[PDB]
């Protein structure tokens, strides 16, 4: 929503805004050019700037007016003498310095707050896409379980599962597929390796699908989470949600629960909010719920916050 | 880097980009590795649960942290902090508030080091290119009428991983028909039709190093214009590869291919640079373009990839990964053009 961006620009005294992060360029333009895409909001509205190699593709996809540049150096001329330039916190130091030296920009203000507030609430159209990515992720996890046998390498299972996801319409995996067996299960971010699975080992299967620009996330462990999903009644804070699962684990005597309970999922695999965080959970928010004890066990579902509750978008047996 | 720091009055350096962390430490921590150079001594900082693995592999002293916010304390009151140009605005502002009175770029020395590949580096790129070669051959054999572009990409990416690659170097391009007119036409749901030009652009990431190859085919027999454009791109590509040598600038190399395509009347349709550097990243220094004048030197690894793109009709691109040797250039990708 560009209307909310302009409204943010108005009450923070920002003249022009520059957006360069591919995910945010998509969110506001409807297209994401691989070789570079850049939005400038000049007061009232926005336009998409692309290199000539991306012009044709951006033209058929963008809801915004598209103009091509031969040199990136052209953008410094259009933003010349901007008093306050609204930028993403992720914008590189190089680019900031270039705006100061070549465009004579006088001050910079972080536009992160409005992008966070916009992207944190997913529309019905966004939820439909995420549900489809979750369906692909469901199929992939089931395929992984059927493929895990004696002597099989973690990476080989990962490859077949990622092949399955793409054959089912996913652009690519949402992240490096985690398949961790034996002592590797004790590691949370244990990306699949050359190590061979033996009988009696705990195999943590963690994967996601990127489908039509939206992500999914699922973890199953083969050889506490239910209560957290059941408790998420909007109006609740993110910390209070984390408290539920962490309390059960602490009550059993494993309070090993080293990472957070979850994270937001959308155009990126890890986004707002985190489940230290005290954001008020609202309907339309798409989050992850993943408790773990580290031997290693992790159970994770992508969950949608609905009116008076939360529902699982990933549907695989726990 | 230490020499750069002393010359530019840089008290401490902070390196955060994973590829640069790997380049200086010899290890790539799965969570978040960070290098802090204090004068003459470089130290690798890793999350507590990545300490063991980092200690086994790193060529630098390793110190663990529980939280990232500990880094702000270790760079307590450094006047001038040397940073990468890729470092985010948020992080620079964090160093201002939590820790720093001045910031200076260290990009020049990183570029100067990484642009020249060691013999060990070229060996890994060679294997990456062999995998990519096998993938493009598989792609060509896989492409038939009615096949979804994405399905072709799925198969060849699977084959790459089975051949030892960590993952594809970038999102595989299988661009057919009207899609071949788009240089970055990542494989889509589009079904390949008879008479389609099909651009196959892929690469492998193998043991931290990248490869890059493009081949173009026609489904069925090529028509007059398809053959016409193809031969011009082929000529441009061949003549550039033969001309690439030390002493020559990137601009001069780009010009070799650009002048040929312009000669045939397709100058307006060669809508990108001739190529780019390849190493720890798929796109690296130098850029082989009219705007880049870096002198090519021995040990540089670049691509040479001219193209002609006519919208709604299609396009042709042919790309090789090429090493700059003592007296010329050596093709690292070997499949027929
Ligand atoms: Zn996960
Ligand atoms: Zn997750
Ligand atoms: Zn290339
Ligand atoms: Zn390529």
């Amino acid at each position: 929503r560009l209307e909310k961006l302009v409204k943010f620009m108005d009450e923070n005294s920002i003249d022009r805004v520059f957006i360069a992060k591919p995910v945010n360029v998509y969110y506001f333009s409807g297209t994401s050019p691989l070789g570079g895409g850049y939005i400038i909001v000049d007061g009232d509205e926005a336009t998409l700037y692309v290199p000539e190699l991306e012009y044709e593709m951006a033209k058929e996809e963008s809801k915004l007016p598209v103009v091509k540049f031969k040199k990136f150096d052209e953008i410094y001329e259009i933003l010349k003498n901007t008093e306050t330039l609204g930028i993403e916190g992720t914008l590189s130091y190089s680019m900031v310095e270039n705006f100061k030296e070549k465009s004579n920009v006088k001050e910079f203000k972080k536009i992160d707050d409005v992008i966070k507030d916009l992207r944190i609430i997913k529309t019905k159209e966004e939820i439909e896409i995420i549900e489809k990515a979750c369906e692909i992720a469901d199929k992939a996890v089931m395929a992984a379980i059927e493929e895990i046998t004696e002597g099989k390498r973690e990476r080989e299972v990962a490859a077949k599962v990622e092949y399955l996801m793409k054959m089912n319409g996913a652009e690519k995996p949402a992240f490096d597929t985690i398949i961790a067996s034996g002592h590797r299960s004790a590691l949370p971010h244990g990306v699949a390796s050359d190590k061979r699975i033996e009988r009696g080992d705990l195999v943590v299967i963690d994967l996601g699908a990127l489908y039509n620009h939206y992500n999914s996330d699922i973890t199953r462990t083969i050889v506490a989470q239910k209560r957290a999903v059941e408790a998420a009644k909007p109006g609740m804070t993110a910390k209070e949600l984390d408290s539920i699962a962490r309390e059960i684990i602490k009550e059993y005597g494993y309070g090993y629960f080293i990472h957070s309970l979850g994270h937001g999922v959308g155009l990126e695999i890890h986004e707002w909010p985190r489940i230290y965080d005290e954001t008020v959970l609202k309907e339309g928010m798409v989050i992850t719920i993943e408790p773990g004890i580290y031997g290693g066990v992790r159970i994770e579902d992508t969950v949608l916050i609905t009116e008076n509750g939360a529902k699982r978008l990933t549907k695989t047996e726990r």
Side-chain angles (χ1 to χ4, degrees), chain A:
Chain A
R1 205 147 256 217
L2 305 141
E3 252 186 293
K4 250 142 240 180
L5 211 179
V6 170
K7 272 179 244 272
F8 187 82
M9 280 164 82
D10 252 76
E11 61 191 282
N12 287 277
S13 238
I14 291 147
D15 300 286
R16 290 172 187 134
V17 153
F18 181 72
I19 294 148
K21 200 201 198 167
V23 138
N24 292 330
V25 171
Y26 179 76
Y27 193 66
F28 288 104
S29 82
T31 197
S32 203
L34 188 83
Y38 315 90
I39 295 164
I40 285 148
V41 185
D42 194 320
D44 325 76
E45 244 277 71
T47 154
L48 175 78
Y49 294 85
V50 295
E52 49 183 57
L53 103 146
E54 296 284 12
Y55 185 61
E56 286 296 315
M57 239 199 311
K59 213 168 140 275
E60 66 184 87
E61 250 223 292
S62 174
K63 260 172 252 119
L64 255 36
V66 198
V67 4
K68 66 174 219 182
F69 53 82
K70 212 133 178 98
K71 288 155 103 245
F72 188 81
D73 294 349
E74 279 161 64
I75 182 238
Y76 301 125
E77 276 289 276
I78 112 109
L79 292 174
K80 203 170 207 88
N81 293 332
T82 302
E83 283 191 80
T84 309
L85 185 74
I87 54 156
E88 305 152 304
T90 43
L91 225 219
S92 85
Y93 171 79
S94 266
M95 275 298 131
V96 173
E97 284 295 286
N98 283 338
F99 285 139
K100 251 195 233 141
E101 218 198 84
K102 291 163 189 269
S103 293
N104 324 323
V105 175
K106 273 91 194 46
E107 63 179 81
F108 301 92
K109 283 219 181 148
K110 290 217 276 283
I111 205 96
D112 299 347
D113 250 19
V114 71
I115 284 166
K116 170 190 178 195
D117 269 273
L118 260 46
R119 279 178 53 211
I120 199 151
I121 316 296
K122 275 90 182 165
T123 60
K124 257 80 239 254
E125 280 106 276
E126 288 178 283
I127 292 150
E128 284 186 333
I129 301 160
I130 290 148
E131 279 189 298
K132 188 81 196 182
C134 287
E135 189 194 84
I136 286 153
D138 277 329
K139 280 170 191 191
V141 136
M142 289 291 254
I145 288 149
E146 212 83 83
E147 212 85 322
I148 283 147
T149 35
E150 156 166 56
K152 211 112 194 223
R153 329 193 140 74
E154 304 175 337
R155 269 223 138 263
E156 225 140 81
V157 178
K160 235 284 236 274
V161 154
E162 289 169 344
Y163 168 79
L164 202 128
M165 285 202 287
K166 196 162 251 212
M167 289 300 275
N168 279 270
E171 213 73 59
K172 60 181 170 275
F175 54 98
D176 288 17
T177 295
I178 288 139
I179 290 158
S181 56
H183 202 70
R184 288 211 75 245
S185 61
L187 292 109
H189 271 240
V191 184
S193 59
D194 232 87
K195 214 248 249 272
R196 288 152 226 161
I197 310 151
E198 183 71 81
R199 52 113 87 257
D201 290 308
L202 268 56
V203 196
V204 174
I205 310 135
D206 197 350
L207 50 94
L210 176 74
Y211 173 84
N212 209 177
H213 298 258
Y214 288 88
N215 294 271
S216 58
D217 206 350
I218 189 170
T219 311
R220 295 291 102 111
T221 300
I222 60 130
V223 178
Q225 195 252 5
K226 264 204 213 190
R227 224 50 70 244
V229 175
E230 257 141 74
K233 46 198 255 231
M236 187 189 266
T237 76
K239 216 223 249 93
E240 275 164 2
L241 225 220
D242 187 276
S243 281
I244 291 135
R246 218 178 275 265
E247 260 170 276
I248 286 145
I249 264 111
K250 212 171 250 93
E251 247 120 85
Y252 271 99
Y254 294 93
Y256 302 94
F257 201 148
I258 45 134
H259 55 88
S260 292
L261 176 61
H263 52 86
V265 176
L267 292 167
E268 289 179 280
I269 185 68
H270 284 64
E271 53 183 64
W272 300 278
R274 240 192 214 215
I275 304 113
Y276 310 100
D277 206 304
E278 232 213 83
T279 34
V280 184
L281 320 164
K282 205 205 106 175
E283 72 174 84
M285 276 184 24
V286 179
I287 57 136
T288 253
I289 292 171
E290 55 181 337
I293 301 147
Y294 316 101
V297 168
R298 183 155 76 259
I299 299 294
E300 165 191 50
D301 282 296
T302 294
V303 285
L304 169 79
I305 310 294
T306 55
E307 215 176 85
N308 211 85
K311 64 178 255 131
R312 293 200 299 128
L313 303 181
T314 44
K315 281 113 170 288
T316 304
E317 46 118 276
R318 259 94 52 100

CSV table of all heavy atoms in Angstrom, one decimal, chain A residues 147-148 151-163 173 175-181 184 190-197 203:
chain,number,residue,atom,x,y,z
A,147,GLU,N,11.6,-41.3,2.3
A,147,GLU,CA,12.9,-41.5,1.7
A,147,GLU,C,14.0,-41.7,2.7
A,147,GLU,O,15.1,-42.3,2.3
A,147,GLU,CB,13.2,-40.3,0.8
A,147,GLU,CG,14.1,-40.6,-0.4
A,147,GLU,CD,13.3,-41.1,-1.6
A,147,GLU,OE1,12.3,-41.9,-1.4
A,147,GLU,OE2,13.7,-40.8,-2.7
A,148,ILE,N,13.8,-41.4,4.0
A,148,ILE,CA,14.8,-41.6,5.0
A,148,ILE,C,14.9,-43.1,5.4
A,148,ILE,O,14.0,-43.7,5.9
A,148,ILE,CB,14.6,-40.7,6.2
A,148,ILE,CG1,15.0,-39.3,5.9
A,148,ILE,CG2,15.3,-41.2,7.5
A,148,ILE,CD1,14.2,-38.2,6.6
A,151,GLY,N,21.6,-45.8,5.5
A,151,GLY,CA,22.7,-45.6,4.6
A,151,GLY,C,22.5,-44.4,3.7
A,151,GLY,O,23.4,-43.9,3.0
A,152,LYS,N,21.3,-43.8,3.7
A,152,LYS,CA,21.0,-42.6,2.9
A,152,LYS,C,21.6,-41.4,3.4
A,152,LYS,O,21.5,-41.1,4.6
A,152,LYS,CB,19.4,-42.5,2.7
A,152,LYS,CG,19.0,-41.9,1.4
A,152,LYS,CD,18.3,-42.9,0.6
A,152,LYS,CE,18.1,-42.4,-0.9
A,152,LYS,NZ,16.7,-42.7,-1.4
A,153,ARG,N,22.2,-40.6,2.5
A,153,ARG,CA,22.8,-39.3,2.9
A,153,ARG,C,21.8,-38.2,3.1
A,153,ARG,O,20.8,-38.1,2.3
A,153,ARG,CB,23.9,-38.9,1.9
A,153,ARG,CG,24.6,-40.1,1.2
A,153,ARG,CD,25.8,-39.7,0.4
A,153,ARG,NE,26.9,-40.7,0.5
A,153,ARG,CZ,26.9,-41.9,0.0
A,153,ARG,NH1,25.9,-42.3,-0.8
A,153,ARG,NH2,27.9,-42.8,0.2
A,154,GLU,N,22.0,-37.3,4.0
A,154,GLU,CA,21.1,-36.2,4.3
A,154,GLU,C,20.9,-35.3,3.1
A,154,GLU,O,19.7,-34.9,2.8
A,154,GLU,CB,21.6,-35.4,5.5
A,154,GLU,CG,21.8,-36.2,6.8
A,154,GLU,CD,22.4,-35.3,7.9
A,154,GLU,OE1,23.1,-34.3,7.6
A,154,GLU,OE2,22.2,-35.7,9.1
A,155,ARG,N,22.0,-35.0,2.4
A,155,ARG,CA,21.9,-34.2,1.2
A,155,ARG,C,21.1,-34.8,0.0
A,155,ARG,O,20.5,-34.1,-0.7
A,155,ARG,CB,23.4,-33.9,0.8
A,155,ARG,CG,23.9,-32.6,1.4
A,155,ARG,CD,24.7,-31.7,0.4
A,155,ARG,NE,24.4,-30.3,0.6
A,155,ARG,CZ,23.5,-29.6,-0.1
A,155,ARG,NH1,22.8,-30.2,-1.1
A,155,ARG,NH2,23.3,-28.3,0.1
A,156,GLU,N,21.2,-36.1,-0.1
A,156,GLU,CA,20.5,-36.8,-1.2
A,156,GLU,C,19.0,-36.8,-1.0
A,156,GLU,O,18.3,-36.6,-2.0
A,156,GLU,CB,21.0,-38.3,-1.2
A,156,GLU,CG,21.3,-38.8,-2.7
A,156,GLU,CD,22.5,-39.6,-2.8
A,156,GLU,OE1,22.4,-40.8,-2.4
A,156,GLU,OE2,23.6,-39.1,-3.1
A,157,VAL,N,18.6,-36.9,0.3
A,157,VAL,CA,17.1,-36.7,0.6
A,157,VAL,C,16.7,-35.3,0.4
A,157,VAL,O,15.6,-35.0,-0.2
A,157,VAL,CB,16.8,-37.2,2.1
A,157,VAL,CG1,15.4,-36.9,2.4
A,157,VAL,CG2,17.2,-38.6,2.3
A,158,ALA,N,17.6,-34.3,0.8
A,158,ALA,CA,17.3,-32.9,0.6
A,158,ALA,C,17.1,-32.6,-0.9
A,158,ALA,O,16.2,-31.8,-1.2
A,158,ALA,CB,18.4,-32.1,1.2
A,159,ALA,N,18.0,-33.1,-1.7
A,159,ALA,CA,17.9,-32.8,-3.2
A,159,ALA,C,16.6,-33.4,-3.8
A,159,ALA,O,16.0,-32.6,-4.6
A,159,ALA,CB,19.1,-33.4,-3.9
A,160,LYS,N,16.2,-34.6,-3.5
A,160,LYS,CA,15.0,-35.2,-4.0
A,160,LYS,C,13.8,-34.4,-3.6
A,160,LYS,O,12.8,-34.2,-4.4
A,160,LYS,CB,14.9,-36.7,-3.6
A,160,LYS,CG,14.7,-37.6,-4.8
A,160,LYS,CD,13.3,-37.6,-5.3
A,160,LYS,CE,12.7,-39.0,-5.3
A,160,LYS,NZ,13.0,-39.7,-6.5
A,161,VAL,N,13.8,-34.0,-2.3
A,161,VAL,CA,12.7,-33.2,-1.7
A,161,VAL,C,12.5,-31.8,-2.4
A,161,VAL,O,11.4,-31.4,-2.6
A,161,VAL,CB,12.8,-33.2,-0.2
A,161,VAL,CG1,12.1,-31.9,0.4
A,161,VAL,CG2,12.2,-34.4,0.4
A,162,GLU,N,13.7,-31.2,-2.6
A,162,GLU,CA,13.7,-29.9,-3.3
A,162,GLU,C,13.3,-30.0,-4.7
A,162,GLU,O,12.7,-29.1,-5.3
A,162,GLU,CB,15.1,-29.2,-3.1
A,162,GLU,CG,15.4,-28.8,-1.7
A,162,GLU,CD,16.8,-28.4,-1.5
A,162,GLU,OE1,17.7,-28.7,-2.3
A,162,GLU,OE2,17.1,-27.7,-0.4
A,163,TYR,N,13.7,-31.1,-5.4
A,163,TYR,CA,13.2,-31.4,-6.7
A,163,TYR,C,11.7,-31.6,-6.7
A,163,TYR,O,11.0,-31.0,-7.6
A,163,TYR,CB,13.9,-32.7,-7.2
A,163,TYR,CG,13.2,-33.3,-8.5
A,163,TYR,CD1,13.5,-32.7,-9.7
A,163,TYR,CD2,12.3,-34.3,-8.4
A,163,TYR,CE1,13.0,-33.2,-10.9
A,163,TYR,CE2,11.8,-34.8,-9.6
A,163,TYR,CZ,12.1,-34.3,-10.8
A,163,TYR,OH,11.5,-34.8,-12.0
A,173,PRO,N,13.4,-23.7,-2.9
A,173,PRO,CA,13.2,-23.9,-1.5
A,173,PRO,C,13.3,-22.5,-0.7
A,173,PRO,O,14.0,-21.6,-1.2
A,173,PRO,CB,14.4,-24.7,-1.0
A,173,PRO,CG,14.9,-25.3,-2.3
A,173,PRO,CD,14.7,-24.3,-3.4
A,175,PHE,N,14.5,-21.9,2.1
A,175,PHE,CA,15.8,-21.9,2.7
A,175,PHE,C,16.6,-23.2,2.5
A,175,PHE,O,16.0,-24.2,2.0
A,175,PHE,CB,15.7,-21.6,4.2
A,175,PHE,CG,14.8,-22.5,5.0
A,175,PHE,CD1,15.3,-23.6,5.7
A,175,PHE,CD2,13.4,-22.3,5.0
A,175,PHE,CE1,14.5,-24.4,6.4
A,175,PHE,CE2,12.6,-23.1,5.7
A,175,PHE,CZ,13.1,-24.2,6.5
A,176,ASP,N,17.9,-23.2,2.9
A,176,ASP,CA,18.6,-24.5,2.8
A,176,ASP,C,18.0,-25.5,3.7
A,176,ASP,O,18.0,-25.4,4.9
A,176,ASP,CB,20.1,-24.2,3.2
A,176,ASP,CG,20.9,-23.4,2.2
A,176,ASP,OD1,20.2,-22.8,1.3
A,176,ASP,OD2,22.1,-23.4,2.2
A,177,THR,N,17.5,-26.6,3.0
A,177,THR,CA,16.8,-27.7,3.7
A,177,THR,C,17.6,-28.3,4.8
A,177,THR,O,18.7,-28.7,4.6
A,177,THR,CB,16.4,-28.8,2.7
A,177,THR,OG1,15.4,-28.2,1.7
A,177,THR,CG2,15.6,-29.9,3.4
A,178,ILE,N,17.0,-28.3,6.0
A,178,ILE,CA,17.6,-28.9,7.2
A,178,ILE,C,17.2,-30.4,7.3
A,178,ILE,O,16.0,-30.7,7.5
A,178,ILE,CB,17.3,-28.1,8.5
A,178,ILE,CG1,18.0,-26.8,8.6
A,178,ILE,CG2,17.6,-29.0,9.8
A,178,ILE,CD1,17.2,-25.7,9.1
A,179,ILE,N,18.1,-31.3,7.1
A,179,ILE,CA,17.9,-32.7,7.5
A,179,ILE,C,19.1,-33.1,8.3
A,179,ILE,O,20.3,-33.2,7.9
A,179,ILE,CB,17.8,-33.6,6.2
A,179,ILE,CG1,16.5,-33.3,5.5
A,179,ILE,CG2,17.9,-35.1,6.6
A,179,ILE,CD1,16.5,-33.7,4.1
A,180,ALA,N,18.9,-33.3,9.6
A,180,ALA,CA,19.9,-33.5,10.6
A,180,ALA,C,19.6,-34.8,11.4
A,180,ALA,O,18.6,-34.9,12.1
A,180,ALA,CB,20.1,-32.3,11.5
A,181,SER,N,20.5,-35.8,11.3
A,181,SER,CA,20.4,-37.1,11.9
A,181,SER,C,21.5,-37.4,12.9
A,181,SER,O,22.7,-36.9,12.7
A,181,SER,CB,20.3,-38.2,10.9
A,181,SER,OG,21.4,-38.2,10.0
A,184,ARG,N,23.7,-34.6,14.9
A,184,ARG,CA,23.4,-33.4,14.1
A,184,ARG,C,22.0,-32.8,14.5
A,184,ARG,O,21.9,-31.6,14.3
A,184,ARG,CB,23.4,-33.7,12.6
A,184,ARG,CG,24.8,-34.0,12.1
A,184,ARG,CD,25.0,-33.6,10.6
A,184,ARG,NE,25.1,-32.1,10.5
A,184,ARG,CZ,24.2,-31.4,9.8
A,184,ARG,NH1,23.1,-31.9,9.2
A,184,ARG,NH2,24.4,-30.0,9.8
A,190,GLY,N,20.9,-27.1,11.4
A,190,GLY,CA,21.7,-28.1,10.8
A,190,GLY,C,21.4,-28.5,9.4
A,190,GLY,O,20.7,-29.5,9.2
A,191,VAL,N,21.8,-27.7,8.5
A,191,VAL,CA,21.7,-27.9,7.0
A,191,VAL,C,22.1,-29.3,6.6
A,191,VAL,O,23.2,-29.8,7.1
A,191,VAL,CB,22.4,-26.9,6.2
A,191,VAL,CG1,22.2,-27.1,4.7
A,191,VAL,CG2,22.0,-25.5,6.6
A,192,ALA,N,21.4,-30.0,5.8
A,192,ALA,CA,21.7,-31.4,5.3
A,192,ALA,C,23.1,-31.5,4.8
A,192,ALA,O,23.6,-30.7,4.1
A,192,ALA,CB,20.7,-31.8,4.2
A,193,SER,N,23.8,-32.6,5.3
A,193,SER,CA,25.2,-32.8,5.0
A,193,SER,C,25.4,-34.1,4.3
A,193,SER,O,24.5,-34.9,4.0
A,193,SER,CB,26.1,-32.6,6.2
A,193,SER,OG,25.7,-33.6,7.2
A,194,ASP,N,26.7,-34.5,4.1
A,194,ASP,CA,27.1,-35.8,3.5
A,194,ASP,C,26.9,-37.0,4.4
A,194,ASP,O,27.0,-38.1,4.0
A,194,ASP,CB,28.5,-35.7,3.0
A,194,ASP,CG,28.6,-36.1,1.5
A,194,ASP,OD1,28.4,-35.3,0.6
A,194,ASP,OD2,28.9,-37.3,1.2
A,195,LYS,N,26.7,-36.7,5.7
A,195,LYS,CA,26.6,-37.7,6.7
A,195,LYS,C,25.4,-38.7,6.4
A,195,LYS,O,24.4,-38.2,6.0
A,195,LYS,CB,26.4,-37.1,8.1
A,195,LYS,CG,27.0,-37.8,9.3
A,195,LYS,CD,25.9,-38.4,10.2
A,195,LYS,CE,25.9,-37.8,11.5
A,195,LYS,NZ,26.8,-38.4,12.5
A,196,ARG,N,25.7,-39.9,6.7
A,196,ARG,CA,24.7,-41.0,6.4
A,196,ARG,C,23.8,-41.3,7.6
A,196,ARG,O,24.3,-41.4,8.7
A,196,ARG,CB,25.4,-42.3,5.9
A,196,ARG,CG,25.9,-42.1,4.5
A,196,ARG,CD,27.2,-43.0,4.2
A,196,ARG,NE,28.2,-42.3,3.5
A,196,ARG,CZ,29.5,-42.7,3.5
A,196,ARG,NH1,29.9,-43.8,4.1
A,196,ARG,NH2,30.4,-42.0,2.9
A,197,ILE,N,22.5,-41.5,7.4
A,197,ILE,CA,21.6,-41.8,8.4
A,197,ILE,C,21.6,-43.2,8.8
A,197,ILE,O,21.6,-44.1,8.0
A,197,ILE,CB,20.1,-41.4,8.0
A,197,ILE,CG1,20.1,-40.0,7.5
A,197,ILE,CG2,19.2,-41.5,9.2
A,197,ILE,CD1,19.0,-39.7,6.5
A,203,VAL,N,16.0,-37.9,13.3
A,203,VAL,CA,16.1,-37.1,12.1
A,203,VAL,C,15.1,-35.9,12.1
A,203,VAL,O,13.9,-36.1,12.0
A,203,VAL,CB,15.9,-38.0,10.8
A,203,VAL,CG1,16.4,-37.2,9.6
A,203,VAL,CG2,16.6,-39.3,10.9
